[PDB]
Symmetry: C3
Subunit: 121 residues, 3 copies
């Protein structure tokens, strides 16, 4: 299970949401063997005055937070991150300079999905 | 201490915010013995175009993120999650299919509350 | 690396965003020796009806979430929190009663920055 939040300037979301959505999901399919339908994304559309970051990232600075189950090795997580960079550059033509990713991890017993404790599925 | 974020489509928040607020808080009172006043909730109201998830969850798909102190056992956390499901179904008549929960945990030394380091209280 | 999210009522953000931005960043410079430019802040502007908390915090209740790399000692984290309280009180004249802070920690291998795996920098 992966829950994804994508924070960006409003205009970046307007223009790129669809392209980002597919790029991110393709990374998860490729790396983690997710089913095509298992896509869960929240785009957090910020007014620029509320999104403050260094001038060496462009108007298309994007922060991706992926909340996942614990357990993947550091090397597997690094590869996932590289694939997200790649897919976003290739499909969105946003430079890796403008993309930032953080993975958060929690044990399965911390999740409820479809009325079930996730450890029980 | 529990900080709760509730992400949903705008219309779901409009119609259900009050009912969800009470249902969630009642779960915390029941399970964790919280005082009635110790309710801290942020409803994150999303335009549907920014909230992308599978078609087997309805317009009332809700994601609840509960940030709490570390230490509760896996079994206690699972029970908490079940009580949230129950209370939301009973009080909101939203099906468990549409409810998703993730607990995040941090040590007390990671928190500041009312000007104090939380470990010191 | 520190990613900061600041949640507040809309009017609190309007009046205090600049003052909070400097106060928080100064705390990070002072405590963690951050460069002056390494400021990354997202202000999450909430309508009051969506921001529910006890009546003993004022209209200027602010929640600061700082996502950082793992490894700092509990004592170093507590000091950081105290400095944030101080700077916000001194520079914003918001009482510590109204300020809440939580630090989240993840290993470096969980981050992508400027196209790089953060552990590799
Ligand atoms: Cl996805
Ligand atoms: Cl609550
Ligand atoms: Cl900062």
């Amino acid at each position: 299970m992966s829950q994804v939040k994508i924070y960006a300037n409003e205009r970046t979301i307007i223009q790129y949401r669809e392209l980002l959505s597919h790029a991110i999901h393709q990374a998860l399919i490729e790396e983690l063997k997710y089913p095509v339908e298992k896509r869960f994304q929240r785009f957090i559309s910020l007014k620029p005055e509320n999104f403050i970051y260094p001038s060496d990232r462009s108007q298309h600075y994007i922060i991706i937070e992926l909340s996942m189950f614990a357990g993947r090795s550091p090397a597997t997580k690094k590869q996932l991150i590289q694939t997200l960079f790649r897919n976003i550059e290739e499909q969105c033509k946003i430079a890796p300079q403008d993309i930032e990713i953080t993975i958060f991890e929690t044990p399965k017993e911390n999740w409820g999905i479809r009325g079930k404790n996730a450890d029980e599925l």
